[PDB]
């Protein structure tokens, strides 16, 4: 649960940084 | 024989992959008409009658004595590191023959999938047989002929 789902939020977060 | 025609279409694809300049096909009226259409449409460089061993240099009359040893020799074309004749497939298959009226042939050439036959693509040749003569589909439409959709060459 941790490994698989943790990145969903981070990789979308990477996209958050892209707009920043 | 549609089986023989399927064998020839597969044979030409195999020869194109290895890029042999010259190959032979069975000597029959259907095969000769098929090859002649490809030659006139620019898919084949040459079309010569011959034997099992090679094309004839001088005319050799065909008779029952040598019919079993006759072959048709066709020259394949390659330009810019690409085969001109890349694919050759039957439409009307031995176990499912497709006869279309001229109206449905016009729809096939207009982008409409008829009886699961994908429509004619740019630069593709679709051959039709009518009264034992092979012609391009566009020519059959010009002559108002209904016929069997045999094969598509690209």
């Amino acid at each position: 649960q941790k490994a698989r789902k943790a990145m969903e939020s981070y990789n979308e977060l990477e996209d958050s940084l892209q707009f920043d | 024989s549609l089986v023989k025609l399927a064998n020839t279409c597969a044979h030409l694809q195999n020869c194109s992959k290895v890029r042999v300049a010259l190959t032979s096909i069975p000597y029959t009226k259907l095969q000769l008409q098929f090859a002649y259409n490809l030659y006139q449409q620019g898919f084949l460089s040459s079309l010569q009658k011959g034997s099992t061993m090679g094309p004839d240099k001088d005319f050799v009359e065909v008779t029952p004595d040598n019919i079993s040893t006759r072959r048709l020799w066709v020259g394949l074309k390659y330009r810019d590191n690409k085969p001109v004749l890349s694919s050759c497939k039957l439409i009307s298959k031995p176990n499912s023959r497709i006869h279309l009226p001229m109206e449905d042939m016009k729809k096939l050439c207009s982008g409409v999938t008829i009886r699961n036959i994908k429509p004619l693509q740019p630069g593709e040749l679709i051959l039709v047989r009518a009264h034992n003569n092979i012609m391009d589909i566009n020519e059959a439409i010009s002559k108002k002929l209904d016929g069997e959709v045999l094969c598509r060459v690209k």
Binding site: - | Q41, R79, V84, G123, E124
Partner: protein
């Protein structure tokens, strides 16, 4: 890489390309048709400059292999009208384009 484009808007004809487990069926479309394809293919078409396209992906829908398959299909599975004409020694006419010509 440069990809051939028919009228700088679409592909030349239809493409049935197999890239590993991905079966790509791409069809050319009329002007103003838009991109109606897998989302991965949509992004590639946008960057490449393809505006009109229809298609369906069968078997594997792995995003990575769809993208690579699409790029490969646009280069190895297309032939320009000019290349077909020269190879066959024939003239290929776009009927729709001639209809609106002088």
């Amino acid at each position: 890489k440069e990809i051939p484009r028919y009228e700088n808007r679409t592909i030349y004809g239809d493409i049935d390309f197999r890239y590993h487990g991905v079966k790509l069926h791409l069809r050319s479309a009329k002007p103003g048709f838009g991109l109606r394809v897998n989302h991965v293919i949509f992004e590639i078409c946008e960057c490449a400059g393809i505006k009109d396209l229809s298609g369906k992906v069968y078997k594997s829908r792995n995003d990575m292999n769809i993208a690579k398959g699409t790029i490969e299909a646009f280069t190895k599975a297309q032939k320009t009208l000019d290349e077909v004409a020269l190879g066959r020694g024939k003239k290929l006419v776009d009927v729709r384009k001639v209809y609106y010509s002088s």
